């Protein structure tokens, strides 16, 4: 069973989006009003599932084939998961989901006019390797309108979930694409107060990881809470 030997760097809740960021409508009603109760870390928080043994399918991380070929900009999304100390987080689960090229999701609830792509599902999972790297192949999703403001459009984005070592590090985020003029305008994006934090969410065009004549690439690194051993406890 898991053991209590780690401690995690306390989250900087001023870096992360706050619960309540009104321009993002849904957050209004879905944000606690009471302060979070800080508790000391114990085994319960400092431990988490290890996904090492889950049976991944072969195309679990390849959206071009996991669902003909999808229509859209073929891209690879790759990066590394590290902790605050800059330490890699290996064998961690990275899951992602996104829309099609036209901004359409394969979910019943999506009725955007852009058609589904018979060949695209939009889900992927990948366990980070020993160095904390993950990679997916997909199509660049299109922006999509959403019912927030009257003319709100999500910048093209991919949703990400990352387990990390404990439940203390577990994170869900979204990746945005470098230069998307929609970024500075997104209320979701804007939930994050520090422009500096925003920058952390922008996947950079990575000509270096692209497949010439095939697909482009974007780099998205993820930093999880710093893990440290307990001392003088």
């Amino acid at each position: 069973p898991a053991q209590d030997n780690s401690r995690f760097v306390i989250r900087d809740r001023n870096w992360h989006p706050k619960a309540l960021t009104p321009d993002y409508k849904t957050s209004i009603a879905r944000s606690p009003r009471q302060a979070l109760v800080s508790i000391p870390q114990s085994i319960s928080e400092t431990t988490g599932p290890n996904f090492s043994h889950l049976g991944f399918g072969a195309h679990d991380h390849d959206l071009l084939l996991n669902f003909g070929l999808p229509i859209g900009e073929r891209i690879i999304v790759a990066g590394r998961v590290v902790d605050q100390y800059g330490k890699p987080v290996p064998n961690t689960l990275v899951e992602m989901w996104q829309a099609n090229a036209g901004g359409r999701y394969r979910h019943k609830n999506d009725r955007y006019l852009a058609p589904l792509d018979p060949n695209f599902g939009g889900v992927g999972r990948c366990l980070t390797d020993s160095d904390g790297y993950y990679s997916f192949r997909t199509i660049k999703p299109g922006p999509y309108p959403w019912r927030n403001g009257p003319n709100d459009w999500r910048p093209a984005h991919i949703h990400f979930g990352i387990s990390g070592p404990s439940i203390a590090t577990k994170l869900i985020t979204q990746l945005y694409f470098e230069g998307d003029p929609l970024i500075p305008m997104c209320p979701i994006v804007k939930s994050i107060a520090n422009p500096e934090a925003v920058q952390q969410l922008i996947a950079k065009l990575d000509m270096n990881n692209a497949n010439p004549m095939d697909c482009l690439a974007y780099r998205f690194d993820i930093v999880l809470r710093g893990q440290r051993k307990t001392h003088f406890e």
Binding site: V9, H16, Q34, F56, Y85, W97, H107, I167, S191
Partner: protein, 200 residues
């Protein structure tokens, strides 16, 4: 002072979280192995229980697009971190609520006792993390059992909650579902009876 790399900022899971984290629940073809809501298989030691609950927004509306993650010790108070579908018991699970099912369920066993960092036993509990559109950063909470008052009384965590009333938000209520032992744990994100959410 010393500053480390800043953590990647959280973003809401958005409305389509299910397509990515709860396929069946999304009603999309699932893959071979999925992390779902059955933490214990029938032949798992401990007392078999069903967990179920609803999630409410600050308006008191069901959150039909939530996604939950749980972490608990097995019946002997141990955290089984090695996730595998072949196990009789998995310490980790996922559940969701959907337009189709507004109540999440989990099949598990009542967890045994674990000690805090100080050596003090904590009452049996289930760790929960909640994600949904509108939730910029996921919320952490604990599910305690009401048939464990003795233990709950002395839990060093429950005891950190200054207000006793607030503690009660964390106590799941024992019940039976098709004559099976169950516990109901409803979460109120905001407002009245707002569930204690922790920071650790």
């Amino acid at each position: 002072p010393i500053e480390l790399l800043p953590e990647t900022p959280s973003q809401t899971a958005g409305p389509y979280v299910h397509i990515g984290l709860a396929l069946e629940a999304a009603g999309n073809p699932t893959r071979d192995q999925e992390i779902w809501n059955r933490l214990a298989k029938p032949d798992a030691p401990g007392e078999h229980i069903l967990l179920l609950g609803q999630v409410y927004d600050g308006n008191g509306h069901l959150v039909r697009d939530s996604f939950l993650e749980v972490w608990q010790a097995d019946a002997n108070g141990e955290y089984q971190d090695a996730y595998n579908l072949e196990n009789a018991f998995n310490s980790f699970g996922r559940t969701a609520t959907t337009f189709d099912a507004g109540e999440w369920t989990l099949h598990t066993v009542k967890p045994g006792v674990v000690n805090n960092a100080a050596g003090v036993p904590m009452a049996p509990h289930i760790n929960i993390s909640l994600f949904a559109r509108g939730i910029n950063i996921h919320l952490h909470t604990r599910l305690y059992f009401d048939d464990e008052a003795q233990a709950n009384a002395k839990c060093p965590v429950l005891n950190l909650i200054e207000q006793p009333q607030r503690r009660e938000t964390l106590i799941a209520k024992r019940c039976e579902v098709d004559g099976k032992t169950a516990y109901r744990f409803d979460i109120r994100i905001q407002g009245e009876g707002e569930t204690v959410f922790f920071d650790f």
